[PDB]
Amino acid sequence: MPHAFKPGDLVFAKMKGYPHWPARIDDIADGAVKPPPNKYPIFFFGTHETAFLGPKDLFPYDKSKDKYGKPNKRKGFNEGLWEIQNNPHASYS
Numbered sequence: 001m002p003h004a005f006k007p008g009d010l011v012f013a014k015m016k017g018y019p020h021w022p023a024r025i026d027d028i029a030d031g032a033v034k035p036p037p038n039k040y041p042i043f044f045f046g047t048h049e050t051a052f053l054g055p056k057d058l059f060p061y062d063k064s065k066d067k068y069g070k071p072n073k074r075k076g077f078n079e080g081l082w083e084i085q086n087n088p089h090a091s092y093s
Contacts, residue, residue: 002060005040010061010088012068013042013053020059020068021077022046022084046080048092 005011005025013023022045028034035041039052059068061084069085071078083092 005055005058008089010084011042012059012061012064013044013051014057014059015051015053019072019074019077020064022061022069022080024084024088025058026050043092044076044080045083045088045092046076046078048076 007025007027009025011023011025012020014020023042024045026041026043028041035052038054040054040058041050042053042058043050061069069081071081083090
């Protein structure tokens, strides 16, 4: 059975106005700003942006890739597809 989301989990993450986006659950570094309650720090592949999202907006990548893992015109998206398939756990800092 599924567990709760944990750092390193791969997802498509949904934000208003944007297609379901390749992303990971990030760790919070020592001394870094923590997310709000019930929110997770989401790192978006390709754009390398971070937002805080709850589980309703998080789709596990393995289950969802056949539907959401297709090229998209939006800035950074196809880069993001490469990253989530080929080096999803790298430092993109």
